[PDB]
């Protein structure tokens, strides 16, 4: 007898196929059967008529490393239908590094002395001992490795440092990390050479992990950063994941046509994947960058002047008698939201076949970018249903089946008998992102319930208390 059967709904199984009327039976942490299950005994038959039952959403791009430990309910994600998170992106992982004041953007994961895990394995052990509501697929970050090894970061690593970083990278993979990420765009790794990155990431082929990257540049020199990424993939011979793809700055609007053709061509000869969030504004550390600071900029938090949270940077700069660019140093460390992308490029990137969905949410931010709470429903409702950017089954595939395949999360991402029961029940007609820039923490509409490994984690718009998540390995 099944524990429960979700009956009367439409299943969108994650294989990019139109939905079909069918029930879904669960037994323990597995999907037992799918189809007309009226003849199967079950302890509960949950009416989900009018709803869609799909695989739980896998957030391909998170910075939930620390949040998973500090807020095990993971409300920002489970209230959106997310059942699994990929952590340690853009070269930023919580472990391995014991440091009381890590260099930005590492501070985006910190709540005060959070960087206390000396070994990557200590971090994973802490997650297993006190599981979060979602599953976690963790990567180790190259910038974190740099901060842990190099006394001085504004230079290339020596052979000995490279040996030290590679050793850490290898232990992490050995412990269960699913890959290694980089973020040469940022200060901690701006002086890292392509060869340093390659040497440090060689353990990837031995352990079979992926190389994920916040490319060195995403504007004027994006072709060069793309070629560097492709080159790295060829030298390591592992799959590469291009993080939050975009063309930023007015001088680059419209160039998504050019970038997607380069990526498409590369996919024909080597293993390449990419993800993106559905918004025209980005968000990270406050940084002296001519392009990031060209348009509207909002402060998400600020250490020296906390009362600046939520304020427009132009106003702050003007009142301090400077350009946004010049006022940045005296406000650091801080976080910001940057409106530097164009809707047409974002739509093109999202619609591009292989693009997976990733939030890039920054959960510790005082006044966060709404992507943290609205990413997935925004794709399902606004883009798929309201704008018809793709049919619902394809939008679902982009956050379930596709993603599970690229990160190698076996037996998840599909509503198939024998697979784990990570599931979402949503209303296709009302599902929507409620979070806005003005109110970035509003709970999404149309998400009925969410199950992780067969246990309901979200019901009646509330965390159930089930710490059902598991640390996953690729």
Measured from the CB atom, the residue of 334 and 455 that comes closer to Zn ion is 334
Site for Zn ion in 341-400 (CB under 5 A): 360
Measured from the CB atom, the residue of 89 and 114 that comes closer to Zn ion is 89
The SS3 call for residue 469 is coil
Shortest Cβ distance from residue 61 to Zn ion (Å)? 6
Site for Zn ion in 74-113 (CB under 5 A): 89-90
Residue whose entry in the numeric block shows the structure tokens 């842990």:
148
Q: How far apart are CA 431 and CA 412, in angstroms?
A: 22
Q: How far apart are CA 183 and CA 126, in angstroms?
A: 26
Shortest Cβ distance from residue 183 to Zn ion (Å)? 6
Measured from the CB atom, the residue of 17 and 291 that comes closer to Zn ion is 291
Among 72, 77, 146, 214, binds Zn ion (CB under 5 A): 214
391, 398 Cβ separation under 8 angstroms:
no
Q: How far apart are CA 291 and CA 311, in angstroms?
A: 19
Measured from the CB atom, the residue of 89 and 375 that comes closer to Zn ion is 89
Shortest Cβ distance from residue 335 to Zn ion (Å)? 13
The one segment of 77-85, 212-220, 291-299, 369-377 that binds Zn ion by CB under 5 A: 212-220
Shortest Cβ distance from residue 273 to Zn ion (Å)? 15
Measured from the CB atom, the residue of 90 and 349 that comes closer to Zn ion is 90
- The C-alpha R_g of the chain, in whole angstroms, comes to 22
Shortest Cβ distance from residue 167 to Zn ion (Å)? 25
30, 415 Cβ separation under 8 angstroms:
no
CA-closest candidate to residue 45, choices 26, 28, 30: 26
Shortest Cβ distance from residue 108 to Zn ion (Å)? 9
Q: How far apart are CA 273 and CA 269, in angstroms?
A: 12
Measured from the CB atom, the residue of 90 and 471 that comes closer to Zn ion is 90
Q: How far apart are CA 213 and CA 283, in angstroms?
A: 16
Residue nearest to Zn ion (CB): 214
Tell me the H-state helices in 320-400.
324-327, 343-351, 371-377, 392-397
Using CB under 5 A, count the residues that bind Zn ion. Answer: 4
Measured from the CB atom, the residue of 359 and 384 that comes closer to Zn ion is 359
Residues 6+ apart with CB under 8 A from 336: 283, 284, 285, 286, 287, 292, 297, 298, 299, 300, 313
Shortest Cβ distance from residue 1 to Zn ion (Å)? 44
Residues forming contacts to Zn ion in the complex (CB under 5 A) are 89-90, 214, 360
């Amino acid at each position: 007898p099944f524990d429960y059967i979700l009956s009367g709904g439409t299943v969108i199984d994650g294989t990019n196929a139109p939905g079909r009327l069918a029930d879904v039976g669960v037994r323990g942490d597995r999907i037992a059967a799918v189809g007309d299950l009226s003849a199967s005994s079950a302890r509960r038959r949950i009416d989900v008529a009018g709803k869609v039952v799909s695989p739980g959403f896998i957030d391909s791009h998170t910075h939930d490393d620390n949040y998973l430990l500090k807020h095990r309910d993971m409300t920002p994600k489970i209230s959106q239908g997310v059942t699994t998170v990929v952590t340690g992106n853009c070269g930023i992982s919580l472990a391995p590094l014991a440091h009381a004041n890590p260099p930005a953007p590492l501070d985006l994961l910190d709540e005060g002395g959070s960087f206390r895990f000396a070994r990557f394995s200590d971090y994973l052990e802490a997650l297993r001992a006190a599981p979060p509501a979602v599953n976690a697929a963790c990567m180790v970050g190259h910038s974190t490795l740099r901060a842990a090894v190099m006394p001085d970061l504004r230079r290339e690593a020596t052979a000995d440092e490279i040996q030290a970083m590679q050793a850490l990278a290898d232990d992490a993979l050995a412990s269960g990390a699913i890959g290694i990420s980089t973020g040469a765009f940022y200060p901690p790794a701006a002086h890292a050479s392509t060869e340093e990155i390659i040497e440090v990431c060689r353990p990837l082929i031995t352990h079979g992990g992926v190389y994920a990257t916040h490319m060195r540049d995403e504007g004027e020199h994006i072709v060069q950063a793309l070629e560097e990424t492709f080159r790295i993939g060829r030298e390591l011979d592992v799959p590469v994941v291009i993080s939050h793809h975009k063309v930023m700055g007015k001088l680059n609007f419209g160039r998504s046509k050019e970038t997607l053709a380069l990526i498409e061509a590369a996919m024909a000869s080597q293993d390449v994947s990419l993800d993106a969030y559905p918004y025209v504004a980005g968000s990270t550390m406050l940084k002296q960058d001519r392009v990031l600071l060209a348009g509207r900029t909002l402060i998400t938090w600020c250490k020296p002047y906390p009362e600046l949270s939520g304020r427009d940077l132009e106003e702050i700069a003007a009142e301090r008698g400077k350009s946004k660019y010049d006022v940045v140093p005296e406000l650091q460390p801080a976080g910001a939201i940057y409106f530097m992308m164009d809707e047409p490029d974002v739509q093109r990137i999202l619609a591009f076949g292989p693009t997976m969905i990733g939030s890039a949410g920054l959960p510790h931010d005082e006044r966060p970018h709404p992507r943290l709470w609205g990413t997935f429903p925004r794709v399902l409702g606004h883009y798929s249903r309201d704008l018809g950017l793709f049919p619902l089954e394809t939008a679902v595939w982009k956050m379930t089946g596709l993603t599970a395949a690229k990160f190698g999360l076996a037996e998840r991402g599909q509503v198939q008998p024998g697979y784990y029961a990570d599931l979402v029940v949503f209303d296709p007609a009302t599902v929507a992102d409620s979070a806005t820039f003005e109110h970035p923490t509003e709970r999404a509409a149309g998400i009925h319930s969410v199950y992780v490994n067969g246990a309901a984690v979200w019901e009646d718009q509330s965390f159930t208390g089930q710490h059902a998540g598991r640390v996953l390995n690729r």
